[PDB]
Design an enzyme around this catalytic site. Sequence first.
Site, short mmCIF file in Angstrom:
data_model
loop_
_atom_site.label_atom_id
_atom_site.label_comp_id
_atom_site.label_asym_id
_atom_site.label_seq_id
_atom_site.Cartn_x
_atom_site.Cartn_y
_atom_site.Cartn_z
N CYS A 84 0.86 -1.18 0.00
CA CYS A 84 0.00 0.00 0.00
C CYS A 84 0.90 1.23 0.00
O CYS A 84 1.91 1.25 -0.70
CB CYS A 84 -0.96 -0.03 1.19
SG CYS A 84 -0.25 -0.49 2.80
N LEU A 85 0.57 2.27 0.77
CA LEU A 85 1.50 3.40 0.84
C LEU A 85 2.67 3.07 1.77
O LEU A 85 3.83 3.05 1.34
CB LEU A 85 0.77 4.68 1.27
CG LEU A 85 1.66 5.93 1.36
CD1 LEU A 85 1.96 6.49 -0.02
CD2 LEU A 85 1.02 7.00 2.28
#
EC number: 3.1.3.16
Length: 151
Positions: A84-85
């Site tokens: 994800c981030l």
Amino acid sequence: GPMGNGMNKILPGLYIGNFKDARDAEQLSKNKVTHILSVHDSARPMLEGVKYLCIPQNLTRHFKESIKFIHECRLRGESCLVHCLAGVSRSVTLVIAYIMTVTDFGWEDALHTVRAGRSCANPDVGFQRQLQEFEKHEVHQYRQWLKEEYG
């Protein structure tokens, strides 16, 4: 740190990392990553040589497609990166759901498993509650579904 120290092996053929790790040709090559499950759009073109599943917050409705994607990769001896981030909350939640389905673990034992490989793993409270609901109401049918589909 708050975005990890690089992509981390969780189980054979299953890695978690941040958005930078997912573009890192050196890490991808070393860990033989051929599948990427992205829970964050880096706005950068997809890489060559990689099968993607991109998920555009309700993550429960994405558990089934995520588990299929990971499991079919692992059953063929290939390696999947979920990112994800920061590689702390969204990707971790998906991987916990996978671990719960291929074991008899509840979400806390699955989170222990992720943290053994990626110590920064820490789903936010919203996702903990979705995983609690998953453990109580749905993981048993997901487990049966996995047996019916892949033996």
